[PDB]
Design an enzyme around this catalytic site. Structure first.
Site, PDB file in Angstrom:
ATOM      1  N   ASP A  41      50.534  79.398  75.022  1.00  0.00           N
ATOM      2  CA  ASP A  41      51.532  80.065  75.829  1.00  0.00           C
ATOM      3  C   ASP A  41      51.831  81.325  75.030  1.00  0.00           C
ATOM      4  OD1 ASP A  41      52.361  78.407  73.780  1.00  0.00           O
ATOM      5  OD2 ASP A  41      53.812  77.290  74.987  1.00  0.00           O
ATOM      6  N   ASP A  56      55.143  82.086  74.059  1.00  0.00           N
ATOM      7  CA  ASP A  56      56.531  81.875  73.670  1.00  0.00           C
ATOM      8  C   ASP A  56      56.737  82.022  72.164  1.00  0.00           C
ATOM      9  OD1 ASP A  56      56.344  78.202  73.977  1.00  0.00           O
ATOM     10  OD2 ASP A  56      55.054  79.702  73.025  1.00  0.00           O
ATOM     11  N   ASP A  96      53.628  81.859  69.873  1.00  0.00           N
ATOM     12  CA  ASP A  96      52.453  81.356  69.163  1.00  0.00           C
ATOM     13  C   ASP A  96      51.799  82.408  68.285  1.00  0.00           C
ATOM     14  OD1 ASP A  96      52.652  78.774  69.920  1.00  0.00           O
ATOM     15  OD2 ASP A  96      50.977  78.775  71.344  1.00  0.00           O
ATOM     16  N   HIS A 156      53.023  48.946  79.942  1.00  0.00           N
ATOM     17  CA  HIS A 156      53.372  48.835  81.349  1.00  0.00           C
ATOM     18  C   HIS A 156      53.450  47.364  81.730  1.00  0.00           C
ATOM     19  CE1 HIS A 156      52.367  53.046  81.213  1.00  0.00           C
ATOM     20  NE2 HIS A 156      51.100  52.777  80.955  1.00  0.00           N
TER      21      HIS A 156
HETATM   22 MG   LIG Z   1      54.116  77.685  71.861  1.00  0.00          MG
END
Ligand SMILES: [Mg+2]
Ligand SMILES: [Zn+2]
Ligand SMILES: [Zn+2]
Ligand SMILES: [Zn+2]
Ligand SMILES: [Zn+2]
Lengths: 49, 1425, 57, 97, 107, 86, 84, 49
Positions: free
Chosen positions: B472, B474, B476, B1076
């Site tokens: 992404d 954000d 990195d 589960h």
């Molecule tokens: Mg990131």
RNA sequence: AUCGAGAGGAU
DNA sequence: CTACCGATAAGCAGACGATCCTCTCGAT
DNA sequence: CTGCTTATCGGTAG
């Protein structure tokens, strides 16, 4: 980042001219991507606004 | 590299012989005599003292002086010194073997304890492995405790042959501290074994009595396990930290050699002085410590060995131990030069393969281009521009041997370049750079790019290369490495390049696609409702950089010339492309614009979105790569992007809270549906409170109340979603993104607008962490939804506190198995990574490890590159006999089964041709053999399987390439086809051998692919279904061979690593401990990660050891029959049916004290013991679940203690069953010895370990009589616990389909080759539970390495790391110095073909690029002038 | 007999799902879990008809 | 920046071998040592100008080779010697196979 | 081939290897009820004549040990009753190419 | 503005959106000895021991420190301090 | 052990690893001022010159493919089929 | 209705950081967690001195 | 700079 | 009807634990 | 969430 862990970095700076204005004549300081809603589900962000 | 040329020849390292240091070779090697424990200071004078460091080793001051050797600093390594020891020493890590060798030998004469006269010893002495030999030897020599004078011969047991000398008794050796204690046997003679004597015995062990143990006459002698002379590492091995002058701070090892030499001195201060006899060895154990602490320190002995200030001190060992350590952190993974890193930003105007490098970082990194008349004109103006403007350089290195630093150097402006110098220039546009994001566990995680230098301080890449790196924007950061040799940079753009890396090898599908804005726009742009006009269209047209310069004719002319979206997006899709889809309601004239049809790089109908343009397998990206190339395909991305962005940039797309507000009626209709969903709960809460609930097979009324409740609110939330879902218009942005694939799944709609739902912990709704309640806010025993944490509100409406909190709980549950999870995930990743490694495909298409062992005989059982594979349907195994014949059968003798002449030009004069039918029967005979065969491969009937060369497309291209028309007849003969197809099944080579064994294994690798071929390339198919021509049919054949040849795997491919990651990548995606089945206890099974952690460790004891038993073919659908076999497998003990075990005092064994028994004795008398009666009440209920009768029960006890316990029993028709038994000097105490045997040691009917046996109705798909694959459901038992050795032998079951998730058992019983299979199936389902798919090859490879050896070699320390690989490979993983020690201790030899060895030696590892030599041909250079 | 038979896997199916195997509208899933929110959150379905499993994100 | 194990393990995968030797030498350790052909060890004294070598102990002066290994490797080979373990270095294979 | 019912004295079982050239095999009754080779999972193992073996190595360029190994007491291996050095041509079904052969020398 | 990144108007950045000051602090001491051999702040210049740094020392006053007014940039010296050691 | 130019098994197709090194050690020599056996139609990049040296198949190098017993097969870029 | 205590106001189950989030009960559970791990990476006026 | 720990960024 | 080898069961030990990246503090 | 060393039993040997 807004106040909902909706982070991200400036990926480019445009000027007032190249920005999308409203009939009012205003222009935004920030333009985030519509894809930052459905995935995460931050509805308070939409409401905060 | 290393400054200054040396005369000596340049040669690489081929072998590495591990051994030990002999004191005689220690004294011959040393140059400094070391005797003094100081540092420098010849009385403070600035130099060094001739005692410790400097005695002739390496200097410090910046002094050439190193015994005339000059060089100094960075050119001279380290010279070793020695230090004479007054008394012998134990080597810290050789403790175990030093004890083991003493246990294996007798003192006084020094000889093996067991000669060949002992036969069991011969078998041990025969073992051709110095490891396991000394292993079996030690297990035999641990018993003996006498030096045998005379021994039984080879003839008679009354005569003996003599061998060894005097037979003293031998001691039992235990370890304590750093010495060896023993006990001679008549009360123990307790004394310690001296290092001085041990060596006297180790010197005296015969030359042949070495080799018998793992030792060498030359390199490793058991006498050199004891330290007599200690070598001393130079400064470079323990370098000081200098602060100018008159300030010294030295390394730790340095202090060690002082403390050692200071102890060794105090020792020789007692020997040549007045020693107190046995007060000496007080300080002798000190010398044993310091020399034993200088090598290792985390030992068994608790003294940690501190240096003042409480400093553990790094003994040589810790310097190497994995992570941060010399081997792992300093040899396998070095820090590197020519590298960079900053924040990544997306840039939708760069091509795929590109990467925007910040101008600064391009000014910093360099590439050393060698001057030639090809570049002099440029490279000179670069040097001129200096290291400040962008296009320039920062060094010029003449061929002499010295750099010119352009940022200084009075002659930066002058400078004449010369033909052959290296200019060190800036990184420039269109250089190759390895780009990468961590955590790196993909080929994709590392890819080459094309540097495009830009301003602004971010690395820039293309949105569509985001999922391979997993990025992404954000915040990195990403690493960049810049190659340095023209040969090295080539090795990047030819392998590592981005486009080359599009078809992901681990999942046989394209890993990059189109995402977000470009993907959400391409939908909006495509809809027929989307139209574009003259002025805008022209821009879009100019935007595509491959536009033919001809504006396409407008789909609309009428009043105003409009274009469609599809019409111009098709400018991005090249020429010659074909794509067929058909989704659900897709009809050549789709009424909903479903699916897609693309002919000749043109959209014809269908909205483009994810399915088409995404990383989907049958999509547009996949095609164009196989159809046009990687170069031509990468460009495709940019085209779709550059255009779609441009439109969107003008159309606009948004989202607001308005995109999550449903109707007035729809909202009420939701809240109403949650209303009836609550009363549905309440009612089945009163049901359960009035004790009216049924139990369910699913156990426990309380468990069956929860099952019921969850499934009512989950059912409610979901159909509350489908309401708001549908109420959402087509002009709803959130719904618009859902469609285009761009982001957002439907639940996100459901939760936001409709209803959050039920939150869960561990699997069940929230618990009563508050003693019969969840929050103090509720009364006790409030078992209803809102109390147990059902959030009713939609995110838009907003939670209430109780909801908010109970929602916070269910949220945290993930964050946790993202913390406990990641740790153990990466360690299973790294393990696999290191376990496989060296396994590569060789040039004979074998698959071998570094040793040279075959692992697979053809990589992945067919020799095909995983990247070249698709899920193609095998049409031959599907359908019915009815459909099959109506399809693949051509009968030229039948009026109603012949190829209608309205097909073939030569068909009307074919009806009847007997000869043509003989080569038209052989098509069928084989097509049937194909069916019979396939149904025996895939028993499921599953037709879709991974195979090279998609034919549907390869044929559909011929359909639109030569514009064939379905009106006019074909020009093929039947001899054209059958003899054509057949002549292809001789051209599809993989292996290529000359002889039998290869060409008969070659047939096998192709066998499957060919069925696919005969499946499509049959007559009634080729002519009737697709209308091919002699031309197009030859073209398809010409293609198929080629694209199959390109599909073959290349020798060099490092499948080991490749296959590993492909399992450790999704293993990283795996949810830790989900369960589960938690909630429905007593039927729990291990899932996800811990289940894998089990398999990869060949785990003996497992958590859920189920073993599935199938029934005998016939009696498989019979209910009662199933509960008859059940009752014959389940371990039924007397303890299972017993209610109460009582003890009575009944004195007269002729009439019972208990009047409820009177009726019993009458019978067992009608037809001398003891008075202490033992009553047992059995339950009728349990006694009929497992079919038994009182007689059978009683006959069993009476034959356990047999005829010495008086046993009686009631019948099967009394209100209460009873077993009364009496016994025959404290007899009330012996009546309890036997109380316990009558329980935990007595079996009635069943196999031991098999507790609980559940029956289940499975669906099985089976060949129906009519031919179709039909759903025939059988009855099958499952179980808890394993006893395969016996359950199999039970009657009534199918002992051919028995299975156990304990593959390790299915080895011991069914033979290793079945174990393999079981192991694979057990791996598959672990990775298949996650929903992740990995190609058979990757797993099968890991599976094979675990078997070939012979047993089940674990993928942990104990397993693959003990094998016969080179020393340095096995020491790069976990046990490091622990293996190195033993390596030299047994004179090992490293072959150095392993990846790790050559990596440790910094040489070119024989891997792909390096799997060969390339020499210059003298006799092909002479021709080239 | 009721005791012999085992737990029955009952889970509410949704018609808002496309399947590969049988392409039917009978798919159940279970929210979770890998990395919740930013980035996003996994969503693992299932086909009780066919057996396949996929994943979102 | 560190070229960790995982990064090495991605390069092996790709098959680019020469690049891995570059990430291990010219851009990192890149040292150069002299071994004696006989007792493969780090002992040979090298007087680089007078072109004289010699190897006291395993008496040489003639049979001497030149290796291009990473410095850290040298360190390890020495550290091991300091533990009485002899890591040999031979420039020709006798074994075959 | 001798078939015992519960177990033989550990002394008698070592009167087995002591008569060349005729080898002796023991067997349990319970271990012979069902034929393992009939099981769904177990491919049919084939013994290679030391000719076909000496021929195999050559065509795959092997050094014997390099060959995948089978335990000497592997159920199937003792079914065929194998010796040290003999080889099996394990021919298994495959889901990536109809049939796939494989070889195992005996440990 | 795709995938966790956003467009930010430069004109408003100019007009002063999200501007922020940054205050880093460098610190140092003169260390004595049990035999009175202290260190010393100053503007150094060669002289026998020589060892120094590469930055422009000329931004220091004399006491050893810069004046608040001035403007540091590259690897300049911010604190001049010497150790007299035999 | 030297398998002759006949009795040839290994793939006649030039594997990526081989090609990617051939171009390499050729772009190497080119950069080292060595002679070029093809007309450089206005070219300046060595790798981009070796690529023209490859389709015209005028590279003088023999690949020595090893099998895992020592023996090998010698292949010239002249003989090898460069498909891709 | 056997009430003993009332809660001063539900909103106080929040901690400092969490309390700055607007409409947190309109946000997906873990979202708030994230936001409560960045607000302490922000730039404000941490003190006047 | 060698050494020990704590705080924080990316999945 | 005691002597001693051999099998098996049961008790206590070890070496692993994501990749990379930036900060700050303290000490022979 | 397990491999290797030790003791205690049940059988077979002079
Ligand atoms: Mg990131
Ligand atoms: Zn020297
Ligand atoms: Zn003796
Ligand atoms: Zn399905
Ligand atoms: Zn030597």
């Amino acid at each position: 980042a807004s106040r909902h862990g909706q982070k991200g970095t400036i990926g480019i700076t445009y000027r007032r001219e190249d920005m999308p204005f409203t009939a009012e004549g205003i222009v935004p300081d920030l333009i985030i991507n519509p894809h930052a809603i459905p995935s995460r589900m931050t509805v308070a962000h939409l409401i905060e606004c | 590299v290393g400054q200054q040329y040396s005369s000596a020849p340049l040669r690489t390292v081929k072998e590495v012989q591990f051994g030990l240091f002999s004191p005689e070779e220690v004294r011959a090697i040393s140059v400094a005599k070391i005797r003094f424990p100081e540092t420098m200071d010849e009385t403070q004078t600035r130099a060094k003292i001739g005692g410790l460091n400097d005695p002739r080793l390496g200097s410090i001051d910046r002094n050439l002086k190193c015994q005339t050797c000059q060089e100094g600093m960075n050119e001279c390594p380290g010279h070793f010194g020695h230090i004479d020891l007054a008394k012998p020493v134990f080597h810290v890590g050789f403790i175990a073997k030093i004890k083991k060798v003493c246990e294996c030998v007798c003192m006084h004469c020094g000889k093996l304890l067991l000669d060949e006269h002992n036969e069991l010893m011969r078998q041990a002495l025969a073992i051709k492995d110095s490891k396991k030999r000394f292993a079996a030897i030690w297990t035999l020599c641990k018993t003996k405790m006498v030096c045998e004078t005379d021994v039984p011969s080879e003839d008679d047991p009354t005569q003996l042959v003599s061998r060894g000398g005097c037979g003293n008794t031998q001691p039992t050796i235990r370890k304590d501290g750093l010495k060896l204690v023993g006990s001679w046997k008549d009360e123990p003679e307790l004394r310690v074994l001296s290092t001085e004597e041990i060596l006297n015995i180790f010197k005296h062990i015969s030359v042949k009595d070495f080799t018998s143990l793992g030792f060498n006459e030359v390199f490793s002698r058991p006498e050199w396990m004891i330290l007599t002379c200690l070598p001393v590492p130079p400064p470079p091995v323990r370098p000081s930290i200098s602060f100018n002058e008159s300030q010294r701070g030295e390394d730790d090892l340095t202090f060690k050699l002082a403390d050692i030499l200071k102890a060794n001195i105090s020792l020789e201060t007692l020997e040549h002085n007045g020693a107190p006899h046995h007060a000496i060895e007080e300080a002798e154990s000190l010398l044993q410590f310091h020399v034993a602490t200088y090598m290792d320190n985390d030992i068994a002995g608790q003294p940690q060995a501190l240096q003042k200030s409480g400093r553990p001190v790094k003994s040589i060992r810790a310097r190497l131990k994995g992570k941060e350590g010399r081997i792992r952190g300093n040899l396998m993974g070095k820090r590197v030069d020519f590298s960079a890193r900053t924040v990544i930003s997306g840039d939708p105007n760069l091509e795929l393969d590109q990467v925007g490098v910040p101008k600064s970082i391009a000014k910093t990194l360099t590439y050393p281009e060698v001057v030639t008349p090809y570049n002099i004109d440029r490279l000179t103006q670069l040097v001129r521009n200096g290291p400040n403007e962008h296009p320039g350089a920062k060094y010029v290195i003449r061929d002499s041997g010295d750099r010119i630093d352009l940022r200084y150097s009075k002659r930066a402006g002058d400078i004449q370049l010369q033909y052959g110098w290296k200019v060190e220039r800036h990184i420039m546009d269109n250089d190759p750079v390895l780009f990468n994001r961590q955590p790196s566990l993909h080929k994709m995680s590392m890819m080459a790019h094309r540097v495009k230098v830009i301003p602004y301080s971010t690395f820039r890449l293309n949105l569509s290369v985001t999922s391979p790196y997993n990025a992404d924007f954000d915040g990195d950061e990403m690493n960049l490495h810049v190659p340095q040799s023209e040969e090295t940079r080539a090795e990047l753009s030819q392998l590592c390049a981005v486009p080359l890396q599009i078809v992901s090898p681990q999942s046989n599908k394209p890993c990059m696609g189109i995402v977000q804005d470009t993907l959400c726009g391409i939908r909006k742009l495509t809809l027929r409702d989307t139209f574009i006009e003259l002025d805008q269209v022209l821009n879009m047209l100019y935007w595509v950089p491959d536009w033919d310069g001809v504006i396409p004719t407008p789909a609309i002319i009428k009043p105003k010339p409009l274009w469609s979206g599809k019409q111009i997006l098709s400018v991005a899709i090249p020429n010659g492309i074909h794509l067929q889809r058909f989704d659900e309601g897709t009809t050549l004239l789709s009424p909903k614009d479903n699916g897609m049809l693309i002919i000749d790089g043109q959209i014809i109908f269908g909205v483009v979105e994810k399915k088409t343009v995404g990383s989907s397998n049958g999509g547009l990206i996949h095609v164009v790569t196989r159809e046009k190339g990687p170069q031509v395909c990468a460009k495709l991305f940019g085209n779709i992007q550059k255009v779609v962005n441009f439109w969107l940039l003008h159309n606009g797309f948004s989202t607001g809270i308005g995109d999550t507000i449903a109707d007035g009626p729809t909202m009420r209709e939701i809240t109403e549906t949650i209303a009836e969903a609550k009363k549905k709960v309440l009612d089945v809460t009163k049901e359960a409170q009035a004790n009216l609930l049924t139990a369910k097979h699913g156990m426990t009324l309380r468990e069956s109340f929860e099952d019921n409740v969850v499934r009512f609110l989950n059912e409610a939330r979901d159909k509350a979603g489908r309401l708001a879902e549908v109420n959402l218009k087509d002009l709803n942005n959130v719904k618009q993104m859902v469609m285009a694939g761009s982001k957002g799944s439907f639940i996100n709609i459901a939760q936001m607008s409709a209803c959050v739902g039920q939150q869960s912990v561990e699997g069940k709704r929230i618990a009563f962490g508050f003693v019969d309640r969840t929050l103090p806010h509720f009364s006790k025993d409030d078992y209803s939804p809102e109390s147990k944490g059902f959030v009713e509100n939609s995110y838009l409406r907003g939670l209430t506190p109780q909801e908010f909190f109970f929602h916070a709980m269910g949220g945290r549950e993930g964050l946790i198995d993202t913390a406990v999870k990641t740790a153990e995930t990466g360690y299973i990743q790294r393990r696999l990574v290191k376990a496989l490694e060296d396994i590569m495909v060789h040039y004979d298409n074998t698959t071998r490890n570094s040793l040279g062992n075959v692992i697979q005989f053809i990589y992945g059982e067919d020799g095909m590159d995983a990247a070249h594979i698709e899920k193609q349907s095998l049409d031959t195994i599907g359908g019915s006999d009815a459909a099959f014949e109506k399809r693949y059968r051509v009968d030229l003798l039948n009026t109603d089964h012949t190829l209608d002449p309205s097909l073939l030009e030569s068909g009307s004069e074919i009806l009847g041709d007997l000869k043509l039918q003989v080569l038209l029967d052989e098509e069928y005979k084989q097509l049937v053999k194909d069916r019979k065969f396939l149904r025996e491969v895939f028993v499921d009937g599953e037709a879709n399987w991974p195979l090279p060369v998609n034919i549907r497309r390869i044929i559909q291209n011929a359909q639109q390439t030569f514009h064939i028309d379905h009106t006019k007849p074909s020009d093929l003969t039947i001899k054209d086809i059958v003899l054509g197809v057949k002549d292809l099944q001789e051209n599809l080579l993989v292996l290529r051998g000359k002889n039998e064994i290869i060409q008969n294994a070659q047939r096998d690798a192709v066998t499957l692919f060919c069925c696919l071929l005969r499946s499509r390339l049959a007559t009634r198919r080729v002519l009737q279904e697709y209308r091919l021509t002699k031309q197009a049919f030859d073209w398809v054949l010409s293609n198929i061979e080629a694209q199959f040849l390109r599909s073959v795997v290349h020798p060099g491919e490092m499948v080991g690593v490749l296959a590993a990651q492909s399992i450790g990548e999704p293993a990283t995606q795996m949810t830790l401990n989900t369960f589960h089945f938690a909630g429905v206890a007593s039927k729990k099974v291990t899932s996800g990660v811990p289940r894998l952690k089990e398999i990869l460790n060949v785990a003996k004891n497992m958590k859920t050891p189920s073993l599935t038993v199938y029934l005998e073919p016939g009696h498989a659908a019979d209910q009662e029959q199933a509960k008859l076999i059940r009752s014959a497998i389940e371990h039924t003990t007397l303890k299972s049916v017993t209610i109460a075990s009582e003890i009575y005092y009944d004195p007269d064994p002729r009439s019972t004290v208990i009047p409820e028994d009177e009726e019993i004795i009458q019978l067992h008398f009608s037809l001398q013991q003891s008075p202490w009666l033992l009553r047992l009440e059995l339950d009728r209920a349990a006694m009929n679940d497992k079919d038994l009768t009182m007689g059978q029960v009683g006959e069993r006890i009476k034959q356990t203690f047999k005829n010495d316990l008086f046993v009686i029993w009631s019948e099967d028709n009394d209100e209460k069953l009873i077993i009364r038994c009496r016994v025959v000097a404290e007899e009330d105490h012996m009546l309890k010895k036997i109380e316990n045997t009558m329980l935990e040691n007595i079996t009635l009917r069943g196999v031991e370990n098999i507790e609980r046996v559940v029956m289940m109705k499975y669906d099985r798909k089976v060949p129906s009589p009519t031919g179709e694959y039909v759903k025939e459901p059988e009855w099958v038992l499952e179980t808890d616990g394993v006893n395969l050795s016996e359950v199999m032998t039970v009657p009534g079951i199918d002992p051919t389909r028995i299975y156990t998730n304990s593959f390790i058992d299915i080895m011991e019983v069914l033979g290793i080759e079945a174990g393999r299979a079981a192991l694979y199936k057990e791996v598959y389902n672990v990775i298949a539970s996650d929903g992740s798919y990995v190609n058979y090859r990757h797993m099968a490879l890991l599976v094979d390495v675990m078997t070939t050896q012979g047993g089940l070699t674990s993928v942990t320390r104990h397993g693959f790391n003990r094998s016969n690989t080179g020393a340095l490979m096995r020491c790069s993983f976990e046990e490091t110095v622990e293996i190195l020690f033993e390596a030299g201790a047994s004179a090992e030899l490293d072959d150095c073909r392993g990846v790790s060895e050559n990596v440790i030696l910094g040489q070119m590892a024989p891997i792909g690029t390096g799997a060969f030599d390339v020499m210059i041909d003298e006799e092909s250079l002479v021709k080239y002038m | 007999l009721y005791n012999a038979q085992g737990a029955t896997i009952e889970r509410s199916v949704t018609d808002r799902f496309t399947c590969g195997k049988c392409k039917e509208k009978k798919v159940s899933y279970y929210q979770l879990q890998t990395r919740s929110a930013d980035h996003p959150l996994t969503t693992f379905c299932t086909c009780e008809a066919c057996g396949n499993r996929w994943k979102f994100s | 920046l560190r070229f960790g194990e995982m990064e090495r393990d991605c390069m092996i995968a790709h098959g680019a071998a020469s690049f891995l030797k570059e990430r291990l030498m010219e851009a990192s350790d890149a040292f150069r040592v002299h071994i004696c052909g006989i007792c493969g060890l780090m002992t040979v004294i090298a007087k680089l100008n007078h072109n004289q070598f010699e190897c006291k102990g395993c008496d040489n002066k003639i049979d001497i080779y030149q290796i291009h290994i990473p410095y850290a490797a040298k360190l390890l080979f020495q550290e091991l010697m300091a533990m009485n373990i002899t890591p040999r270095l031979y420039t020709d294979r006798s074994r075959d196979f | 081939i001798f078939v015992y019912q519960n177990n033989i004295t550990p002394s008698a079982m070592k009167l087995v290897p002591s008569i060349p050239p005729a080898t002796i095999e023991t067997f349990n009754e319970a271990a012979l009820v069902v034929n393992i080779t009939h099981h769904e999972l177990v491919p049919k193992h084939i013994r290679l004549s030391s000719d076909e073996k000496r021929e195999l190595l050559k065509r795959y360029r092997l050094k014997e040990s390099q060959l995948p190994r089978i335990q000497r007491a592997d159920p199937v291996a003792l079914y065929l009753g194998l010796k040290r050095g003999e080889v099996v041509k394990i021919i298994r079904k495959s889901e990536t190419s109809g049939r796939y052969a494989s070889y195992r020398i005996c440990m | 503005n795709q995938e966790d990144s956003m467009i930010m108007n430069q004109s408003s950045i100019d007009r002063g959106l999200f501007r922020s000051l940054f205050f880093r602090s460098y610190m140092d001491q003169e260390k004595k000895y049990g035999m009175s051999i202290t260190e010393t702040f100053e503007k150094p210049q060669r002289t026998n021991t020589l060892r120094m740094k590469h930055g422009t020392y000329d931004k220091l006053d004399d006491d050893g420190l810069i004046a608040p007014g001035v403007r540091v940039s590259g690897e300049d010296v911010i604190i001049g301090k010497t150790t007299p050691i035999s | 052990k030297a398998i002759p130019k006949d009795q040839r098994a290994t793939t006649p197709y030039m594997t990526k690893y081989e090609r990617a090194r051939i171009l390499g050690t050729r772009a190497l020599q080119i950069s080292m001022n060595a002679p070029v056996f093809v007309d450089l139609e206005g070219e300046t990049d060595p790798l981009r010159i070796a690529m023209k040296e490859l389709a015209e198949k005028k590279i003088p190098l023999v690949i020595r493919r090893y099998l895992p017993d020592g023996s090998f097969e010698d292949w010239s870029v002249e003989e090898l089929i460069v498909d891709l | 209705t056997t009430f003993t205590h009332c809660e001063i106001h539900p909103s106080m189950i929040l901690g400092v950081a969490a309390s700055i989030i607007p409409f947190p009960d309109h946000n997906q559970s873990p979202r708030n967690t994230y936001q409560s791990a960045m607000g302490k990476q922000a730039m404000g006026v941490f003190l006047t001195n």
